[model samples]
Target chain A: SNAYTVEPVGTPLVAAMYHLPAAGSPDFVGLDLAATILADTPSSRLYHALVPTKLASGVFGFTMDQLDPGLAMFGAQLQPGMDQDKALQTLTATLESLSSKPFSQEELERARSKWLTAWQQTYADPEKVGVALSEAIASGDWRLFFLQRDRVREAKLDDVQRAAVAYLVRSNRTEGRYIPT
Target chain B: SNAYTVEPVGGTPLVAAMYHLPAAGSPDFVGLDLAATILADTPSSRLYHALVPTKLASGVFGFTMDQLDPGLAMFGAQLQPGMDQDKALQTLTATLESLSSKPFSQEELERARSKWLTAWQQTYADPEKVGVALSEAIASGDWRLFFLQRDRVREAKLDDVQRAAVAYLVRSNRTEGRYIPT
Candidate 1:
């Protein structure tokens, strides 16, 4: 794993992030979304462990979904006086556990329907749609817009688990820590 | 030949699904999404209206694709017990093929457009939601397609939807699957 420290004169709080290459193609869109769900959302692993426990003020995870191989990001914005090492390990362990514990059918369905409410309330803003469309065009072809949605809509439990194992190799990720003065 | 069955559990409910490799970016490409809506999207949709009322199915669902080169239009129905798998499959196939001869009524085309419009509009529900949607658009190729697809939706017509159905939803172009009780 690539590790770096940016003290910024040392912070009162610690902001940590881990990034790995992921969501490089349209075909893997489902797996990529599943991974983010496991990491950041309110019900996600990292949030459950870090936020509820008061280790971090906030947590986040997502794939860059770039063209020609991209990055999967996992991070936490920590509380003042938090132990950076403890939060990092918990983030790492929770992320790595996704592959080992394997996502349950319940979890997968939870992830699937997660979009239902989102789709219901938020779709159809042209400005937002334009951003998505711009991202689609940047990825390779504009048509990938629906292709990725279909894949995510059809995501299965096994595929998500398989992807976590292959994509989240600890040794391959770039680990960074920011310490506030 | 592409037909197959899976029996996951005894007495379990069933599902019958079919998917066809619809052309992508052909003149008909944009219409594929509309075709999916006409066939199975809302209660007024063909499959749900036909099968659900007759009790042949409990529900219906399906979606079109966005692969730049080629993709599919996939459809499915939740089967009612005692339903004939063969009969159900035939009806499903015929229902899709119906688009060719019937074409979409102006009403159907507008409905499809309306629903797609809602989907894009709903993207603003929250910031967390838009990133993944945008990323997918980026992953596909051009981010500008976010609106390009929106334009195509606005510009789509009944003929294109029906044409996409006729061209891609043909029996010869499909793979059918049934998940039923053992």
Candidate 2:
């Protein structure tokens, strides 16, 4: 909903962030998972938009995953000496493009399958499951761990888009940028 | 530095850009014109959408710096993890030759000019940048060639670059090298 930037000496990049919600809510898993899919992977839009032209070095998105309200984030690490305003504008447009240009059903399916495969692997390992279950309980319900995993399998393109429409907005978000130091 | 993108974006290392151009004396030298134009000069470049979006490389760039001796122009992608290193090189060569088809549209060509014009305004302010802008200009025989080439870039069109690829950027004329991480 607000924005701030700090330019300090020795800072290597124009690192920036956008904070969203649904942190620990049941919707957090699907929406924030969609958030990550929107920008986290190499194939993600902002990644292609920024990294390739040398505007940014990296971009990522994910939810904080807590029991109560928490942060779901999308961010970029700009290339050194890039035009801060241009890069930020391009990044904003790319992320906001998610609303104007909806994601394909194929994209959602791929996201779902990746989640199922990851969780099944997590369930396979008691060592990994120990921490996973602990976090599930901390998230207010151990059942959410399984239930959310199920929702991920059933996640729809529209719901994900709707979630983005609601949460990924200027009024609903805080944007931050680091210049140096 | 020709251009720099300093970022506190994190410990992520440098992403670089480098280019070479014929100093002077060659005709279609603005062949150097469309050289940087149609190639990796920006995110909108031909391969700009191809190589970078495909994630084979994190970035792509090619540009010419002036010199009396015709310098080899460089073009290629910044390699991504696990990439087929040669894929980028092949595409690099493939694109300019594809230019030989002369199928390029005026819209995209217009896009390049407008893009270059916007970028040119910013190129003047940096001392480090203008430091060599004049250097490359003078070294090539006249400092005005710098600005002469300025409008020359505007005057360029699809036919110019098409012939240039046929004229230059050829296999015998170009060289490819890779820095091995292994």
- Report lDDT (Cα) of residue B51, candidate 2: 69
Candidate 1 off by > 4 Å: A1-67, A71-181, B1-12, B21-27, B65-70
Top model by lDDT, which number? 1
DockQ for the candidates, in order: 0.09, 0.03
Q: TM-score, each model?
A: 0.48, 0.45
Error of 1 at B15 (Å): 4.1
Question: Among all windows of ten consecutive residues in candidate 1 chain A, which has the lowest summed lDDT?
Answer: A1-10
For residues A61-132, could you state the per-residue lDDT of candidate 2 as single tens digits?
655654244665666776567777777777767766677778776456545544665677789999988888
After TM-score superposition, what is the CA distance of residue A53 in candidate 2 from its true location, in Å?
4.2
Which CAPRI level is candidate 1?
A: incorrect
Report fnat in order of the candidates: 0.19, 0.00
